[PDB]
């Protein structure tokens, strides 16, 4: 199989991985969308009863038996759909992740002058609606009528925006080119690319807790309101992110834990990890409501409504607060170089495990001499599928993307995998399996967590949110019906592959009743177990 070689490097690829665009993009406007403090306690509640629970069982689970995402499926053949579903998120994911990463190039790219292109009114672009402060804000008519161009329907889809598809192109290549050559290899990119987005971070906190109105902001990022929780759509979002931003049913954990060795620690690696996932994410929160609080005290207006809702703040509302500063430029250049590196680190290892589970599941020789090939193959696919997300109509498709087909089938996704693990195959298999592998048992909060609280809670949470549905919008534009049904579908493709595969699977099981071939399709294959020879012992043993 192949280890590690040290802890720390495991550590320092699995916080690669799992911190990205996901702390510093999405959760800003999740969080202003649900009105700041109000998002905050359903959000910490989800992260302490089902977050960290999950991610142990999973790296616990890849470690035991020393397979990816899709080989661990021999404890119970018949529940094989749940790796397939994770590949089919994970592509889903990588289409679009990469067009936001090309987007930050674009903004980057424009940041290199003197004087930032949307600090003014005075462009050809510029309507006489437009009202600097050097209410429509000179950043919001650039990103809508300069950069987006936006149409006026999803279905209109107009021409394609060439200098977004350079960005794309160049994105891809980028990253074709650290996929082939090794990069991951040398210890000083990993090091570098995991370790100054915090020192960028901590240059904006400083630079922005020291103006006036911060404290308003950061009071209104941090004030809870109480009858703002006792609905399910601010339940349903912190579920969505938690599990988003954790990665939990992406697939990539289990198959990078397949590399550690048995009797490896998993139990404090994966405590360190969400630790650090959450702290990342409440840092850049208070980094961006710091100069929130700043902007609406310089126009005079309440903390909330000075900026839109929508996936856009972080593209719209910082840049024309950065305005308002001195040497903008040099601002507006390390914010975006974090956000590309926090991007591409995510992208890369996305892509590495991906690659890895078609490769281990095709199995034979042939297809291991030409893993360049299979590579190339898939980051073609992605830029050509991403293609038409960077049309004029390409924003309504990639919110659709994002609110849809990665949001919540990764809940159920996972409800599925600790379900089938605690009650088909047993949970005190598990935990002496837990024991053999670490020397002690699991702690009795994280089996109470599995056997009872987490399901209960998802399915609480799955009942309320689909007896109470409301159909997207975005900023007063309505979606058509086949759009939303679209999404459907878009979330319901993942979801479908366990029951299609356990269908097809019981249909080639032996046997002369439909008991008797569940019994036999679910108990656990001869293979089941640890990998070395020696780890062979107790109830495994020849
Ligand atoms: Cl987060
Ligand atoms: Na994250
Ligand atoms: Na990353």
């Not at 293609?387 to 390409?394: R, V």
């Not at 087909?405 to 919540?408: G, I, L, N, V």
């Given at each position: 199989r192949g280890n590690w070689g040290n802890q720390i490097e495991f550590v320092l690829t699995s916080v690669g991985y799992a911190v990205g665009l996901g702390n510093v993009w999405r959760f800003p406007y999740l969080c202003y969308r649900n009105a700041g403090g109000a998002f905050m306690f359903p959000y910490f509640i989800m992260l302490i009863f089902c977050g960290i629970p999950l991610f142990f069982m999973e790296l616990s689970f890849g470690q035991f038996a020393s397979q990816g995402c899709l080989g661990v499926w021999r404890i119970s053949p018949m529940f094989k759909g749940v790796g397939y579903g994770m590949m089919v998120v994970s592509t889903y994911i990588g289409i679009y992740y990469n067009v936001v990463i090309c987007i930050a190039f674009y903004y980057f790219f424009s940041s290199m002058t003197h004087v930032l292109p949307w600090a003014y009114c005075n462009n050809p672009w510029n309507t006489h609606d437009c009202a600097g402060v050097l209410r429509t804000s000179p950043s919001e008519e650039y990103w809508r009528l300069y950069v987006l161009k936006l149409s006026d329907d999803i279905g209109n889809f107009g021409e394609v925006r060439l200098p977004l598809l350079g960005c794309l192109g160049v994105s891809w290549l980028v990253v074709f080119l650290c996929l082939i050559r090794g990069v991951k290899s040398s210890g000083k990119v990993v090091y570098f690319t995991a370790t100054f987005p915090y020192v960028v971070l901590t240059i904006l906190f400083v630079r922005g807790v020291t103006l006036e109105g911060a404290f308003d902001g950061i009071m209104y990022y941090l004030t809870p309101q109480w009858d703002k929780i006792l609905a399910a759509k601010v339940w349903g979002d912190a579920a969505s992110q938690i599990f988003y931003s954790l990665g939990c049913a992406w697939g990539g954990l289990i198959t990078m834990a397949?590399?550690?060795?048995?009797?490896?620690?998993?139990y404090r690696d994966s405590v360190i990890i969400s630790i650090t996932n959450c702290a990342t994410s409440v840092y850049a929160g208070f980094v961006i409501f710091s100069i929130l609080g700043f902007m609406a005290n310089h126009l005079g207006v309440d903390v909330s409504r000075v900026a839109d809702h929508g996936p856009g703040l972080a593209f719209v509302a910082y840049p024309e607060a950065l305005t308002?500063?001195?040497?903008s430029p040099l601002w507006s250049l390390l914010f975006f170089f974090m956000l590309i590196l926090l991007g591409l680190g995510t992208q890369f290892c996305l892509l590495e495990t991906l690659v890895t589970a078609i490769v281990d599941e095709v199995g034979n020789e042939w297809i291991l001499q030409k893993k360049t090939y299979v590579t190339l193959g898939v980051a073609v696919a992605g830029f050509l599928l991403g293609?038409?997300?960077?049309?004029?109509?390409?924003i309504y498709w990639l919110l659709l993307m994002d609110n849809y087909?990665?949001?919540?089938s990764l809940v159920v996704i996972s409800c599925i995998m600790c379900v089938a693990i605690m009650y088909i195959y047993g949970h005190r298999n598990y935990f002496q399996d837990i024991q053999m592998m670490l020397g002690f048992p699991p702690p009795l909060f994280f089996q109470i967590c599995w056997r009872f609280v987490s399901p209960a809670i998802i399915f609480f949470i799955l009942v309320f949110t689909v007896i109470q549905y409301p159909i997207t919008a975005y900023n007063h534009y309505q979606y058509p019906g086949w759009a939303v049904a679209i999404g459907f579908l878009m979330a319901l493709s993942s979801v479908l592959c366990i029951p299609l595969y356990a269908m097809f699977r019981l249909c080639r099981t032996d046997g002369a009743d439909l008991l008797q071939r569940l019994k036999n399709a679910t108990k656990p294959s001869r293979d089941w177990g640890p990998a070395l020879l020696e780890h062979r012992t107790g109830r495994y043993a020849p």
């Open positions: 397949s590399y550690n060795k048995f009797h490896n620690n998993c308002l500063l001195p040497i293609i038409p997300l960077t049309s004029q109509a390409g087909a990665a949001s919540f």
